[PDB]
């Protein structure tokens, strides 16, 4: 996930990401978008809900 997205998420309320077959590594990049109220992770191939 781009770091700039993580930075701007400080005011984001809804985020949707589509990887269409690409495995997505969060590597703990979600604890700065604290304003988010809706999280959509479609075709991101996690195989595990991130912490």
């Amino acid at each position, epitope marked *: 996930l781009p770091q700039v997205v993580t930075d701007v998420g400080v005011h984001l309320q809804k985020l949707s990401i*589509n990887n*269409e*077959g690409t495995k997505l590594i969060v590597l703990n990049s979600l604890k700065k978008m604290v304003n988010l109220t809706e999280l959509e992770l*479609i*075709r991101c191939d996690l195989e595990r809900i991130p912490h």
Partner: nanobody
Amino acid sequence: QVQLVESGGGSVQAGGSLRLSCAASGYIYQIEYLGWFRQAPGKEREGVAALATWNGQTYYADSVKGRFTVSLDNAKNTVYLQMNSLKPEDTALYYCAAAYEGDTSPLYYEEYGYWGQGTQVTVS
């Protein structure tokens, strides 16, 4: 709205070959997801294949994987299906399937919004 026309099936032998096809008319740009759906006689329809419109990622059902090959002709707005060494399990009713944007249904007829006439494929 969007209409689909397909052909290229019929009666073949196990060990024959077929070249399925389907052409699209109407709104050709708005269609995001394309695939094939086959229907056994009296049984539920099965999503045969799936393809991203411009992302270009191809998908197929396990029962037809390695035997059925999707083909798309952007020039003529056509979707083909080329298969060989068929099996009697391929005898089914195949419908041209198109889905607009927002949906990520590879082989599920749940959200596809346009279907073709239906071509009977017979493999003995």
